[PDB]
Amino acid sequence: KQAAADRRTVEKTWKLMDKVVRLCQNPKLQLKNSPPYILDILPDTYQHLRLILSKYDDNQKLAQLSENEYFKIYIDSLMKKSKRAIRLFKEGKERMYEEQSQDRRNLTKLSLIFSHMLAEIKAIFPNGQFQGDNFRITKADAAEFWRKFFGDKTIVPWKVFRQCLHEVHQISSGLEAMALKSTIDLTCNDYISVFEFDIFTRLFQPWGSILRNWNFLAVTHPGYMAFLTYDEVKARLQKYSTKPGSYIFRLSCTRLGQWAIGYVTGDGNILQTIPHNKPLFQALIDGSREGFYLYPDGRSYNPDLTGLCEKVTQEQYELYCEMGSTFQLCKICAENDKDVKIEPCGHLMCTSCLTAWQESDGQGCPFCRCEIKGTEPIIVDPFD
Numbered sequence: 001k002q003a004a005a006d007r008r009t010v011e012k013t014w015k016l017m018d019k020v021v022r023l024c025q026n027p028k029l030q031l032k033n034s035p036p037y038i039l040d041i042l043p044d045t046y047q048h049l050r051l052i053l054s055k056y057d058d059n060q061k062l063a064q065l066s067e068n069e070y071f072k073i074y075i076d077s078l079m080k081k082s083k084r085a086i087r088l089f090k091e092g093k094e095r096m097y098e099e100q101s102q103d104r105r106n107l108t109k110l111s112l113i114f115s116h117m118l119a120e121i122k123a124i125f126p127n128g129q130f131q132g133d134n135f136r137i138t139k140a141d142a143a144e145f146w147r148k149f150f151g152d153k154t155i156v157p158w159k160v161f162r163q164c165l166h167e168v169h170q171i172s173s174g175l176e177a178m179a180l181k182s183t184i185d186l187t188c189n190d191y192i193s194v195f196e197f198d199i200f201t202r203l204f205q206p207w208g209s210i211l212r213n214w215n216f217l218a219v220t221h222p223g224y225m226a227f228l229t230y231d232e233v234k235a236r237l238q239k240y241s242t243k244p245g246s247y248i249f250r251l252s253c254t255r256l257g258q259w260a261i262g263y264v265t266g267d268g269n270i271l272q273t274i275p276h277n278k279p280l281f282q283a284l285i286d287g288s289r290e291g292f293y294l295y296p297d298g299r300s301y302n303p304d305l306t307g308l309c310e311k312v313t314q315e316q317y318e319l320y321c322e323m324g325s326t327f328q329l330c331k332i333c334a335e336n337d338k339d340v341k342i343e344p345c346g347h348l349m350c351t352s353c354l355t356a357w358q359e360s361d362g363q364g365c366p367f368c369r370c371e372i373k374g375t376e377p378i379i380v381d382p383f384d
C-alpha cells in the first residue's frame with residue numbers, strides 16, 4: 001500500500017536524489033562517466049518529474065495524478081531506491097572507494113535501476129502526460145497475453161504476473177522464477193509495468209517460445225554479457241582479435257529492448273551491430289552460417305540454437321541471480337518476501353512456505369534439514 005503521490009511527496013524524492021548526486025560527486029569514488037551514469041540519470045529524472053508537474057497544472061489535475069496507481073508505485077519506488085543509495089554510502093564507508101567491493105557493485109545495481117526507471121517514466125508519461133492506458137506493447141501476441149490477464153492495467157504485482165505467465169509458459173522452479181523476476185522486474189520494485197513487459201517481450205521474442213528463448217539466450221549462453229558496457233565488451237573481444245568470428249552480445253542501458261552484438265572481423269577489428277525487431281537467435285544462426293558469429297566469448301563451442309525454430313540446472317539459475325536484487329525474496333515460492341528466520345541454522349523464507357513445510361511433516365529446516373529449534377520474524381533487504 002503506497003501513499004498518495006502529491007507534490008510534497010514528489011519534492012521529497014528530489015531532495016533524496018540531490019543527496020545521492022552529492023555522494024556520487026565525491027572524487028574518491030573515481031566514478032566513470034559510463035552508462036548507466038547516475039550523475040546524468042538523477043538530474044534527468046528530476047527534469048521529467050518537473051515536466052509531469054507542468055502538465056498537471058491545477059488542483060484537480062494534481063489530484064488525478066496523486067491517485068494514479070502507476071505514479072504512486074513509481075514515487076514510492078524512487079523514494080526507496082534513493083534512500084537505499086544514501087544507506088549504501090553510510091554503511092559502505094571506505095568500501096565505496098574500492099571499485100571491486102560489494103558496496104560499489106550494489107551502487108551499479110542501483111544505477112541500472114535508476115536508468116530503467118527513467119526510461120519507464122518517459123515511456124509512461126511521454127512529454128509529461130499519462131499514456132499508460134494507451135501504451136502499445138510492441139509484439140501483438142505478447143500484447144494479447146497482457147490484455148487477457150491484466151486488461152488495461154499499466155502495472156501489476158510480480159506475484160500476479162508470474163502466476164498468470166505460468167498459465168501460458170510453465171516456469172519449472174523457484175530458482176527459475178527468481179531468475180525470471182530479476183530479468184522482467186528491471187526497476188526492482190516487485191511490480192511488472194506494461195513497459196517492463198514490452199522490454200522483456202521485445203528482447204526474447206517470439207512470444208510463443210519466450211521462456212525457452214530467455215533460458216537459452218541469457219541464462220546459459222556463453223556469449224551473453226547482460227548490461228556489460230561497450231568498452232568492456234570491446235576490451236573482452238580484444239583478447240580474441242586473432243580469432244575472427246569471436247562474438248558477444250549485450251543489452252544496452254540507453255537503448256532498452258535492443259541487443260548489440262560485438263564481433264571480431266577477418267581483419268582483426270572489433271565491430272558491432274544492432275539486430276532489427278527480430279529474434280536474437282535468428283540473427284545469431286544467420287551470422288553463424290555467414291561466418292560472422294562463430295565463437296561466443298572466444299569459446300570454441302557455439303551452442304546450437306536451431307531448436308528454438310520449432311535442462312537448465314539450479315546452479316545455473318543461482319549464478320544468473322547474483323547480478324539481480326532478489327536476496328530478499330523467498331527462494332521456495334519466489335512470490336513472497338522472506339519474513340521468518342529459522343534457528344539455529346539461520347535460513348530465511350516466507351511464513352507461508354514455512355507453514356506448508358511444517359504441515360507436510362517436513363523434517364527440520366526445508367533447506368538444510370537441521371532441527372528447527374525456533375523462529376524469529378525478520379525483514380530482509382536485497383543487499384544483505
Ligand SMILES: C[C@H](c1cnn(C)c1)n1cc(C(F)(F)F)cc(-c2cccc([C@]3(c4nncn4C)C[C@@H](C)C3)c2)c1=O
Nearest residue numbers: 105106108109112182183225226227228229320321323324
Ligand atoms: C554486467 C553489467 C554491468 C553494468 N555496468 N557494468 C560495469 C557491468 N551488470 C552489472 C551488475 C552489477 F552487479 F551491479 F555489477 C548487474 C547487472 C544486472 C542487474 C540486474 C539484472 C540483470 C539482468 C541479468 N543478466 N544476467 C543476470 N542477470 C540478473 C539483465 C536483466 C534483463 C536481467 C543484470 C548487470 O547487467
Ligand code: NA
Nearest residue numbers: 185187189191
Ligand atoms: Na518493476
Ligand SMILES: [Zn+2]
Nearest residue numbers: 330333350353
Ligand atoms: Zn515462500
Ligand SMILES: [Zn+2]
Nearest residue numbers: 345347365368
Ligand atoms: Zn536451515
